[PDB]
C-alpha cells in the first residue's frame, strides 16, 4: 500500500530539495541498524513485499507528473507510472520479478523492458556517458516531462535513457550520498546545469563495494583500500570509514551486524 513522497521541480528551493531527500531517506531506511556510524538499508531477505517499496510523485512547472518506484533494499529505481501506463526494468531474478507485480496494480498498461537499469545499460541506450549528461533542476524538469511524454511516445528511447540516468542519480544517488545531495544543493543554489564530475561518478560505481568494505571493516578499518577520485580526477585510496561518514548516507545490508 506504498508510502509516497511528492516533489515538484516547479519553484524548487535549496531547502525544498534538501527537504525532499532528508525525507525519503526517512521512508527508505530502518531508522537504526547502523554500522560504525553509517545507516543500513533494510535487508532483502526478511522483507515482506508490503514494505519492499516506496513511491515518489514528481511534478512540473510544465504542470505534469509521474510516479517512481524505489526498491527499499536497493535505493535504486525499479520502474514508474505516468498516468495509465507503468514501466519496469527487466528483473534480474525470479523473486525480484514477483515483487514488482505489487507495484502499479491499478495500471491498465503494465510494460516490462528487456534490459536492466544499470548505468552501463542506460549509457549504452542514451548513446552517451553520464559525464556528457547534464544534471541540475532544468535537466530534471525536462526529464520528468520526457517520462510522461514517453508513455505517449512523443519521446524516443535514448531520450528516455537519459532521463533515467538523470533521476537515478539526482535521487537514488543523492539519497545514497550526502555528498551527491549537497552537490545538487549547490547546483540548484547557483542555478548551474552541468554534468557530474568524476568524484560523483566513482562514488556511484563503488557504492556497492563500499557498503561491503564498511560493514566488514574491523571497528571501522577497511580490509582492503577502495580507490576513489576527487573532483579533479586525481585518484586516492580509502583505508577507513572515518572519512566516509560526512559523505555516504546509506548502505545496502551485507552482513549480520557485529557484537
Amino acid at each position: 500500500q506504498y508510502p509516497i513522497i511528492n516533489f515538484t521541480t516547479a519553484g524548487a528551493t535549496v531547502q525544498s530539495y534538501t527537504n525532499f531527500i532528508r525525507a525519503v531517506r526517512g521512508r527508505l531506511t530502518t531508522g537504526a541498524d547502523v554500522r560504525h556510524e553509517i545507516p543500513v538499508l533494510p535487508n532483502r531477505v526478511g522483507l515482506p513485499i508490503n514494505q519492499r517499496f516506496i513511491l515518489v510523485e514528481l511534478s512540473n512547472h510544465a504542470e505534469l507528473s509521474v510516479t517512481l518506484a524505489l526498491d527499499v533494499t536497493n535505493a535504486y529505481v525499479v520502474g514508474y507510472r505516468a498516468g495509465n501506463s507503468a514501466y519496469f526494468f527487466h528483473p534480474d531474478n525470479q523473486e525480484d520479478a514477483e515483487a514488482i507485480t505489487h507495484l502499479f496494480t491499478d495500471v491498465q498498461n503494465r510494460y516490462t523492458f528487456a534490459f536492466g537499469g544499470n548505468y552501463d545499460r542506460l549509457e549504452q541506450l542514451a548513446g552517451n556517458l553520464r559525464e556528457n549528461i547534464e544534471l541540475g533542476n532544468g535537466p530534471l524538469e525536462e526529464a520528468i516531462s520526457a517520462l510522461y511524454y514517453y508513455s505517449t511516445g512523443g519521446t524516443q528511447l535514448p531520450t528516455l535513457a537519459r532521463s533515467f540516468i538523470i533521476c537515478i542519480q539526482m535521487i537514488s544517488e543523492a539519497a545514497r550520498f550526502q555528498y551527491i545531495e549537497g552537490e545538487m544543493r549547490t547546483r540548484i543554489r547557483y542555478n548551474r546545469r552541468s554534468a557530474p564530475d568524476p568524484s560523483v561518478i566513482t562514488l556511484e560505481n563503488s557504492w556497492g563495494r563500499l557498503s561491503t568494505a564498511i560493514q566488514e571493516s574491523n571497528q571501522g578499518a577497511f580490509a582492503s583500500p577502495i580507490q576513489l577520485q576527487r573532483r579533479n580526477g586525481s585518484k586516492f585510496s580509502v583505508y577507513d570509514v572515518s572519512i566516509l561518514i560526512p559523505i555516504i548516507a546509506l548502505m545496502v545490508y551485507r552482513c549480520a551486524p557485529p557484537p
Partner: nanobody
Amino acid sequence: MQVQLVESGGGLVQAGGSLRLSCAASRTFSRSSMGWFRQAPGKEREFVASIVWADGTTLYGDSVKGRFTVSRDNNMVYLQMNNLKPEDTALYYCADNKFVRGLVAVRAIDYDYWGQGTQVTVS
C-alpha cells in the same frame, strides 16, 4: 504528445543562392543546446550546426562550416545558408537537446525532440 518544434524557410534556390531557416519551440524552458541536422533521402541525418544554449557558442559540421551561421533568439532559433551548392539538397531539421553537455552533442542520438522538417534544393 511532445514539445512540438517547427521550422519554415525551405525552398528552391539556384546554385549559389542564399536561404534562411527559422524555428519555434512551443512549456519549454531548460535547453542546454539546439541544432540543425540535414538528411538526403535514403541516407542518414548529417549534423550541420548547433548553438549551445547558456553561452551561445556556435558549432558547425565540416562541409558547411563557412557558409552557414547559427543564432539564438529570446522561444526561437535561426540558420543562415549562404552560397548553396546542389549537394546541400536535402531535408533540414530542428532539434532540441535538453540533456547532453552542449558542446559534446553532435548526433541524431543526442537530441530529444525533432522538428518536422523543411526542404532545400539548387541548380
